[PDB]
Every structure is written in C-alpha cells, then in structure tokens.
C-alpha cells in the first residue's frame, strides 16, 4: 500500500527503477507483495539461508539432449463452426460430416476449473517456491492404509506430481516430479537454482525434482525413475497416444497379480507420474495453443483415452481426477449422437466409425441416459463381424475399432438396470462367436510378448465362461521361441479379465439367466431370438428341454437347454434327456439363408468347446460351407446347430 | 503478456512505396498468421489483408489487391507488409493482429499500437499563424493554417491560460495543407488589461512563433 | 463482400443505462462475428469472439447473441471508460468487413452554441488570402448545420467543419467552420453570414459582419 | 561505514528504497539496505527473488521500464553464487 523505488549498481551505472503498488495491486487481483515480502525470510542471515539451500537434492545426472515436440492439435478444418464450451447451442453442428471445433479459450475454463493451492507451505516445497494458487486440476490416489499417497496437481502450464510415504512412524517422506515448459516454471524463492534442480531440459521443456537430501535416499531404496526414459515420452509423445501408453500399463498391470496389493516399486511409481502427464499433456495441449479452436475430432480421440484412462484408476487405486473434464464437450458430443443413425453406424468409413464411438463415450459419461448408443456399438462389431473372416483373430485395424465401441457396452453392464437388453445381448452374442481358438491363439501370444492383441480382445465381454486355465494352455502358440513362463503369465493375466465373479463386466444382466441353479458350472449361453440356450455341465437347468450329447466319460457332461422366449420352467424337466439328431440330408451349398438366426456350436469330446458360429447374412453361412470349416474325417469333433426353433441338431455329413 | 508492435510508419509519395513491419513477442509466432487492419481518417475500420500462417497464400481485399505482398519470417518474429502504388484513399493508421491460432479459421484478439500512413505528396511546411479578433463574454482565438504535417502545438499563455481553450483538430484542406483553430473565451472585462499571446509550434518544421491578440 | 449494416451510428446515453448495439450481415455468418472497441488514439480491443463469447480481462457488463443475420451486442451498464466507438466484425467468408461503427456519446441536457464569426484578418489579408471563421461554442447534442451566406448567396464547398471531443468538464461539443475565398473575392463582397441550425436553437440564428467593421 | 552489512533475524509498507550490491562488491555476498524517507540490512538473494516474483506474477506489467527491470534482476541474481558460499567466512562486517 505504497510506491517503492529500487536502485542498484550496474557494473558502474546508478540504475534506479520504480515499482508501484498503487498501481499493481489493483491492477493485478492476485498480487499482495506483502505476503511476499513475508515469505522470503528477508532478514534470514546466511548462515540459516545457506542451510536451506543445502537441504534440498540436487542434479547430478542433469542433462537431456534436445527433443522435438509432436504436433498433436491439427490446424482448424476450413471453415468449421468454432464453438463455445460454456454456450453449447442447439443445431450448430449439423452432422458427423461437418467440421466442428470447440474454441480453446472457455474449454481452458472448463477443464481447468477447480482451484486450489498447487505449491503448498509443506515442509519440503516452501523452503523452495514461493507459494502460488492457481487454477489446476490433479489426479490423487492413496494406497497402504493412506501411508502412501500421490498427487498429480497441474495447470495448463506444469505438473507437479508429488509422492508422500509414511514409515508407520509420524516421519514424512516427500519427493516432488515437476514437468512443463522451461519458461513456465514457477517461482523459485531461496538462493535457490532451476539447474540444480533440472534432471532433463530439451528445447522449451523441462523436469524438475524436489526433495530433501535425507528424502531422495528415502525414495532410493524402491523408486530409481529411468527419468531419461520418461521425460522423452513425455514430450516426444501425442497426447493422446501417451495416454494410450499409461492405459497399456494399467490393463497390462490389472487383470496381473499386479494393483490388487499393490507393489510399491519403481515401475509403479514411474507410471503414477505417468498418469498425471497423460492428463497433463492433453490440458496443455489446449491451453498452450492460445486463442483458437481445437478440433473436434481431436478432442473425441484424446478424451475417449483420458475417460478410459480415469476408469481402469478408478478401479486399481482409489483415485480421483478432479477437474479435466468439460461439459460443454460432453453436449456437444452428445448432442451429435442424435444427428446419425445408431443401427446403420457400422455401415459408414474405418475414421467415420471411430470418431462417432469416441462421441458415442464422451457425450453422457455415466451410460445409461439415452440407451441407443449401445446399437451404435452393436452396429459397428455386427458390420465388422460379416467382413471380418469368422475366427480369425482380428487384425489391428479392427481391434483398435471395437475396443473403442467396446466401452459404451462395458458400462451398461456395469448397471442393475437392464437399459434395453436387446441390443446388448446380440452385442454378447457376436462377441461370443468372435472368441474362437485361435482368437485365444493370438491374444495369449500378444499377452507373452506384451503386444497390442494384449489390451482388449471381444471374447472378454462373451459369453463364455469355459474359459479356465487348463482349457487356455492347449490353445497357446506352440513355439519353443516363446517363454513358456510368459504364456503360463499369459494364461493367468487373460483368466483375471474374465473371472466371472467379481468382475461384474462378464454377467447378471440376461433375462434368461434366471434360469439356471448352479450358475458356476454353465459353459456358454447363446441367446438367439426367440430362444436362448444354456450350455452347461449342470442337469438342472429349467429350461424348454434338455440336450446331452454324447459327450465322453471324461468331461464331467454337455448339457444344452433351450429357454423359449426367455421365461422359464418351474422345475427342471425330469428324465432323459433327448439325443441330439443326426444329420446327412443337407446339400453343402445354400442359395438362402436357411441357417440364419442360428448358432454353430464346435466342440472337442476331450477339450470342451471350440468355436461359436452365428449365421447373420448370407454372406456368413456361404463363408462357412464353401469354407474348410466341416471336417467330419475328424470324429472327435462335432458340429451343434442351435436354432430358433429350440432344437439342438449334429451335422455329420453334406454332399 | 502478447505484445503486436508496428513500427513501418512513413509519409510516402502517391504510388510510391513503403514497408510496414509487425514486431510480435509473448507468444509462440510462427504457429499464429497475421491480419491487417486500417482506420482511415474520420472512417471506421477496415480490414485489409490476411497473410497465411505459412505465409505462401497471401489474400487481400479488393481495393488493395495485386498491391500488397506480405512476407514472415517466423525466425525473426517479424511480419512485414509490402504496399506498391499507394493511394490517397490508402491514407491512415495500420494495425496488425494474430488471427488464426493453429490457423485457418479466423479472428482478431487486441491489435498492436498502429502506425501512421500519410498519402500525401505535397510539402515541409510551417504554417501561417493570423489572430481571430474578439466582438458580458467575449472569444478570440489563433487560426493556424496551412502546414504539413501533422501536429501542430498550441498554447494560451504558455500554458498559463487553461480555460475556455478550444484547439480543434485540423481539417486537411483541398491543397494538401492542415488547417486548424484555437480559441479560447475570456471575461469580456479583461481584454484591456490581460494580454491574450498564442504559442503555436510545429515541430515538423521546427518552426515556433508566438502571436499577440487584440 | 458481405456487408455489416450496425445501427445506430451513434448513440447518447448516461453513465449505467443499458446500451444496445445492433449489427446485421448481408448473408449468413453463421456464428463468426466479433465486436472490438476503439478508443482513438489508442488500440482496438476485442470484447466478443463467437458472437456470443465474452473473452477474457473484459467485464461482464458486456454481452453479445445471435445467429446468422442479426447480432447484438449489449453493454448492461454503462461505465465512464465505456465512452467510446464499437465496431462489429464479421470473419465468416473473406474478404472481412466491419460495421460502419457506433460511436458511444455520453449524454447531457440540450444546449445551445454561442455562435461568433471573425473576419479575414488584417495580417491574413496582406498575403492575398480571406478565411472567414465561425465559432460554435459549447453545445449539444453534436448534429448541428452552419451555411454561409455571402451576399445572402448560399456558398458552397467552400466551407469545413472541424469538431471538438465532447469535452471532459461539461460534455459539450465545439465547431469550428472555415469559410476561404482569395482576396480578390472577399473585395468584391460586402455581406458575410454564418446560419447556424441547431436542435437546441428556438430557430436557426445569423450572426454577420459587413466588411471592415 | 560497511557498504556490505550482515544480516539477522519492520515490514514492506513503511520501506521506500532498496539498495543492491553488485557481483564483486561484497566478495560473493548478496547484501541489500531496506530503509524508509535510517538502514536495515536485509538478504539480498531472498531479496532479489521477490521482485522477481513481484515481476513474474505481473505479467501485465507492460512497461519498457518495468520489463527491463526485470530481465536485468534475472540476469543480476544469477551473476552472484551461493554455491561458493563455502566455508567463506560468514560474518565480515558488522
């Protein structure tokens, strides 16, 4: 509340400069220099200021050659309608055909809401920064009984992700990673030096740790970052494929013997910080680029990731994000959503199906409002299902395609209401008849060497539930190449996703699933329409009927009862059960639908069941008679048509 | 924060030639593409050109068409707007903007400060400094007329008489010349008694002359 | 070229009234016009984006809306700084265009002007040149008509106007309109009259001099 | 006397100029004089960065004659080393 004048020597000149605070501390709302003033100990002596500064680690290994920034957020498309996020207006956009942007200056405002104190006056950050408050946004878990926490706070312009152990004592141990634009670091306080402190500094970024010289060998004994390796990833990274990066960590981690207690080592670790940066980039992203418009299809690919990404979080650590998610894109999104046709969606391009699922997602979170989006996704895996060569593993132009439409049906599913079963039940179904052999076959190889088959795959949301370890070895990759350690971790990983309880994404949402006694010892269901069947080891199923094939004395039996119309029976039939049928009297060739509507059970004596078949289109059955697909030179193998009908029926011989 | 500087201000010959250059810093340039806007004297705005954010495409309006050629130096920061044939109507005060923000959809944030354009070929000139005398009130005033260019200064008093003064802003007459009044009014029972002197100075000419009025 | 028609031109009102500026489009634009105040001298600055996005460090007083054809913005309380002149812009199809502008006055009670004339003056005349001045002095609104008559002759185009800024005391405006003849003419004349029209005048008066008195 | 004071643990209001030593004045020592319109010794690095906080938190401090202040209090905090404030003998003066 004055005007201060400031003099000094200038290697010989008596510069003098006047500050005003009559005029700053109006002019700017969040300056008070007297807190300030108050926050460095202006009269601390140096003898105290030289033990504050040697306190705090420094760099050795300070370096980082150059890296290039990737251009993630593409030039606005000619003429597109930029959009307000807070005013998201009705009928501006038009359809998925027109070009659409959100303007980055409110989606900033939106994204980074939440506000807070970013640089606290804990024990280890104010003897080093001058305490700031500003608008942020942090991804935060707390694990081991709250004894060990991380907080990925950041702004459209760093992250400090800080992690907090406790050592069941009342000691604190405290280690702070922060990551941003060189010239967007905060304020340094002490005699303090930003290269002390710098571990990597390539072209505009930088990393910037924060600790105690006792707290850095604290965190050494489990925590030795390859902090090279991250900070490359960081920046040379899209923001959408890194967060892509941190959701293979986490799915590859998951379904693992890996979040379930968590091991407090240096992988996790690293990818906690790994986490923070892969919301981080995506807010920096839009607000580094000033006052212009992001791309809307841009904006559905990364916030599809980040969605995905804040879901598997959810469920490995009791984490929150608070504060990098806009409204106005989720109406917008939505909003959209009721512009196309959700049945005919997969007839449209590879780009078109993609953009419109990420939509479908980030337009109403929480699914479950307008239940239609899941015949979107039904549409999409049904039009890929007929051009896609039946049990072939799918390659990974159409895996990256279903796994987005995948996760609209994932949280459906998460529901007790039902939300219209139809579309999702014949979502199941297709998936069903997607988990063949050698859909397993490639999964487990890309599980034994971590590749891309190793995030998703249709059989987890099948309905499919013979799947045990045992069944899983005799259909791996059969290579000595392989570590065989690595497939039995392949088997383990691939069982924890579809464990079907305590899953709760494999079950508990069919009409005819009422109808079984013992739930554990059904193999498969495959509901048709006009009939549903359950394919079990157990007798008392209330079903229509009860089938048995000739099983052998080794499997313990094969049951299939048929539900009619998805109501059941007030006791199990008692019994015999009927014979399956056998059949020669059909010509190979069909020029009609004659199987359409019904199901191709393949199944192994010994083994179990092999494959799924469900004849859709035309185009289906004529793929599996002209086919290799009827091999009855091989008897230990038979044939099951389910139909609508209700009947079970063998094929044994065509002309 | 985001500074736009414009520095190319001139007079120029009618059809002849000048450079304006666009000094931006605060920001990321090269990732940015330019507009130009121009406010004529006694008009509103109007916007001018546009150059592209790779600088090759270069889209004007259809007065100045074929004339201007924009160039940018993304190194430099420094955007520079070539003008050929320039015209009377070409005559005032250029700003640049940033327009295109990760770049082909459009649009202004603040300008830079502007330059001054003088279209105007005529001549360095003091102008002619005439009393306008006065007939309970009474006004007399200074009429300064034909100098070039812009501005002239003018005080009553030196600045010892401050109120009731009315210096108008100059008319650019049909020759090419400023022409411009200063006034001031005056209790009518001082005008024996207080001497009423006009200080006109035209600094483009570094010409000062006083003028008694009676 | 699409043309962005605002109306008003100008516009008077008090410190807090609520001010409406309109601006129209020739075509559709859709949702791609922006409004940017002036004040001379200084720089323009932009106050609304998407027709409808107050953008940032500009208080929230301002507000803009519409679609396509018509557009508006409003400014809810007039302010002392908001004393100036809006331009709308629309960037839907190049080249761009603005508004004519509206240029904000601030209101004040009808006044007349205190009209005087002045002779060519003696100095004036030795070099062969005759300025005949008339003095408008402090009034309002800023509308106002000077005609000269020489000889009871309506002159034309031999007269120009120049206008003060409403000034920072009292509001009120000034004119000053030139009347120049040559020597030769000014000689061959005898009557010279200034009729000033104004809104704030019973009816228009003339104030006149016959030559050298 | 002592141009280069020594510092010990009065507020900002009633304070008017400070006065900086140069990289060489104080053998290293960054030492600065608070004062009102009467000399307190203050620490000049804990000073120095202030302003520069001041400065940097005023982003709209828009003034040719502000934002050259401020790159040259940048330039002037780096010039001094508190890494070889060693065992270099702390308490020269006063």
């Given at each position: 509340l004055s005007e201060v004048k400031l003099h000094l020597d200038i290697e010989g000149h008596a510069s003098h400069y006047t500050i005003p605070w009559t005029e700053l501390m109006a002019k700017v709302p969040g300056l008070s220099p007297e807190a300030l003033w108050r926050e460095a100990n202006v009269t601390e002596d140096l003898a105290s200021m030289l033990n504050r500064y040697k306190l705090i680690y420094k760099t050795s290994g300070t370096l980082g050659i150059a890296l290039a920034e990737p251009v993630d957020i593409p030039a606005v498309s000619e003429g597109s309608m930029q959009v307000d996020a807070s005013k998201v207006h009705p009928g501006v956009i038009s359809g998925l055909n027109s070009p659409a942007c959100m303007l980055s200056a409110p989606l900033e405002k939106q994204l980074f809401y939440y506000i807070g104190t970013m640089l606290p006056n804990t024990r280890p950050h104010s003897y080093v920064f001058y305490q700031l408050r500003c608008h942020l946004s942090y991804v935060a878990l707390s694990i081991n009984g709250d004894k060990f926490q991380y907080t990925g706070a950041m702004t459209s312009k760093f992250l400090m992700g800080t992690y907090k152990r406790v050592t069941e004592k009342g000691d604190e141990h405290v280690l702070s990673l922060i990551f941003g634009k060189t010239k967007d670091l905060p304020d340094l306080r002490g005699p303090f030096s930003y290269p002390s402190l710098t571990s990597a500094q390539s072209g505009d970024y930088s990393l910037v740790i924060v600790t105690t010289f006792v707290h850095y060998a604290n965190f050494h004994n489990y925590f030795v970052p390859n902090l090279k390796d991250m900070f490359s990833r960081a920046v040379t990274m899209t923001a959408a494929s890194y967060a892509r990066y941190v959701l293979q960590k986490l799915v590859l981690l998951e379904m693992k013997g890996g979040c379930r207690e968590p091991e407090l080592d240096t992988e996790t670790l690293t990818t906690m910080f790994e986490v923070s940066v892969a919301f981080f980039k995506v807010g920096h992203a839009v607000g580094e680029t000033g006052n212009g418009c992001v791309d809307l299809r841009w904006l559905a690919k990364s916030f599809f990731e980040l969605t995905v990404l804040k879901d598997i979080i959810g469920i490995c650590y009791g984490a929150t994000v608070k504060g990098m998610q806009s409204y106005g894109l989720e109406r917008l999104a939505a909003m959209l959503m009721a512009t196309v046709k959700m049945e005919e969606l997969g007839h449209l391009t590879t780009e078109k199906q993609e953009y419109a699922l990420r939509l479908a997602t980030v337009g109403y979170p929480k699914a479950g409002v307008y239940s239609g989006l899941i015949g979107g996704a039904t549409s999409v895996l049904l039009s890929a299902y007929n051009r896609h060569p039946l049990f072939q593993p799918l390659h990974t132009v159409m895996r990256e395609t279903l796994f987005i439409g995948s996760h609209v049906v994932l949280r459906e599913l998460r529901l007790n209401v039902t939300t219209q079963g139809p579309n999702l039940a014949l979502y199941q179904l297709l998936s069903t008849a997607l988990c063949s052999a050698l859909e397993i076959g490639e999964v487990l190889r890309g599980l034994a060497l971590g590749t891309e088959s190793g995030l998703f795959s249709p059989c987890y949301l099948s309905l499919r539930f013979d799947l045990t370890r045992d069944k899983l070895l005799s259909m791996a990759p059969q290579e000595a190449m392989l570590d065989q350690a690595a497939v039995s971790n392949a088997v383990d990983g691939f069982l924890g996703r579809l464990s079907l309880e305590r899953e709760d994404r494999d079950a508990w949402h069919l009409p005819a699933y009422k109808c079984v006694d013992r739930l554990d010892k059904v193999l498969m269901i495959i509901p048709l329409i006009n009939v549903t069947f359950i394919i079990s080891s157990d007798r008392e199923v209330r079903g229509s009927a009860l089938y048995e094939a000739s099983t052998t004395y080794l499997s313990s039996s094969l049951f299939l009862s048929p539900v009619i119309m998805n109501k059941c029976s007030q006791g199990a039939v008692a019994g015999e059960p009927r014979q399956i049928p056998k059949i020669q009297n059909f010509t190979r060739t069909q020029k009609s639908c004659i199987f359409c509507g019904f199901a191709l059970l393949s199944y192994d004596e010994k083994e179990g069941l092999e494959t799924t078949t469900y004849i859709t289109s035309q185009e289906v059955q004529n793929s599996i008679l002209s086919s290799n697909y009827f091999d009855f030179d091989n008897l230990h193998v038979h044939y099951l048509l389910l139909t609508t009908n209700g009947t079970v029926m063998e094929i044994a011989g065509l002309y | 924060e985001v500074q736009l500087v414009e520095s190319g201000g001139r007079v120029v010959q009618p059809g002849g030639s000048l450079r304006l250059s666009c000094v931006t810093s605060?920001?990321?340039?090269?990732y940015y593409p330019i507009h130009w806007v121009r406010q004529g004297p006694g008009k509103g705005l109007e916007w001018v050109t546009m150059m592209s954010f790779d600088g090759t495409s270069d889209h004007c309006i259809s007065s100045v068409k074929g004339r201007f050629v924009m160039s940018r130096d993304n190194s430099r920061n420094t955007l520079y707007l070539e003008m050929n044939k320039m015209r009377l109507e070409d005559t005032g005060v250029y700003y640049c903007a940033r327009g295109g923000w990760k770049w082909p959809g459009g649009a202004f944030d603040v300008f830079g400060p502007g330059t001054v354009v003088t279209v105007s070929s005529a001549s360095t000139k003091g102008p002619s400094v005439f009393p306008l005398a006065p007939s309970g009130t009474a006004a007399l005033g200074c009429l300064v007329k034909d100098y070039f260019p812009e501005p002239v200064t003018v005080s009553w008093n030196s600045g010892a008489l401050t109120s009731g003064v009315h210096t108008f802003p100059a008319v650019l007459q049909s020759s090419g010349l400023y022409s411009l009044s200063s006034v001031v009014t005056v209790p009518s029972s001082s005008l024996g008694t207080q001497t009423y002197i006009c200080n006109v100075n035209h600094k483009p000419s570094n010409t000062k002359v006083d003028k008694r009025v009676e | 070229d699409i043309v962005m028609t605002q109306t008003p031109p100008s516009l008077s009102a008090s410190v807090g009234d609520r001010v409406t500026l309109t601006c129209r489009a020739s075509q559709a634009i859709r949702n791609n016009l922006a409004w940017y105040q002036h004040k001379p001298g200084k720089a323009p600055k932009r106050l609304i984006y998407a027709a409808s996005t107050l953008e940032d460090g500009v208080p929230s007083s301002f507000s803009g809306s519409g679609f396509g054809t018509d557009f508006t913005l409003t400014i809810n309380s007039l302010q002392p700084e908001d004393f100036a002149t809006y331009y709308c812009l629309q960037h839907s199809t190049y080249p761009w265009t603005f508004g004519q502008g509206t240029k904000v006055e601030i209101k004040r009670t009808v006044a007349a002007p205190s009209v005087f004339i002045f002779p060519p003056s003696d100095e004036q005349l030795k070099s062969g040149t005759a300025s005949v001045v008339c003095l408008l002095n402090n009034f309002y609104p800023r509308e106002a008509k000077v005609q000269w008559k020489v000889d009871n002759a309506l002159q034309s185009g031999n007269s120009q106007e120049s206008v003060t800024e409403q000034d920072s005391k009292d509001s009120t405006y000034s004119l000053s309109s030139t009347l120049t003849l040559s020597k030769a003419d000014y000689e061959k004349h005898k009557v010279y009259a200034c009729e000033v029209t104004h809104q704030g005048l019973s009816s228009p008066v003339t104030k006149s001099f016959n030559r050298g008195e | 006397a002592y141009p280069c004071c020594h510092v010990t643990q009065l507020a900002l209001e009633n304070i008017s100029d400070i006065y900086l030593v140069s990289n060489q004045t104080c053998d290293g020592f960054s030492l600065a004089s608070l004062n009102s319109p009467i000399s307190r010794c203050a620490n000049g690095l804990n000073v120095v960065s202030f302003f520069i906080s001041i400065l940097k938190r005023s982003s709209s401090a828009l003034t040719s004659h502000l934002r050259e202040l401020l790159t040259t209090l940048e330039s002037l905090y780096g010039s001094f080393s508190v890494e070889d404030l060693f065992g270099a003998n702390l308490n020269r003066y006063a």
């Open positions: - | 605060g920001f990321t340039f090269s | - | -």
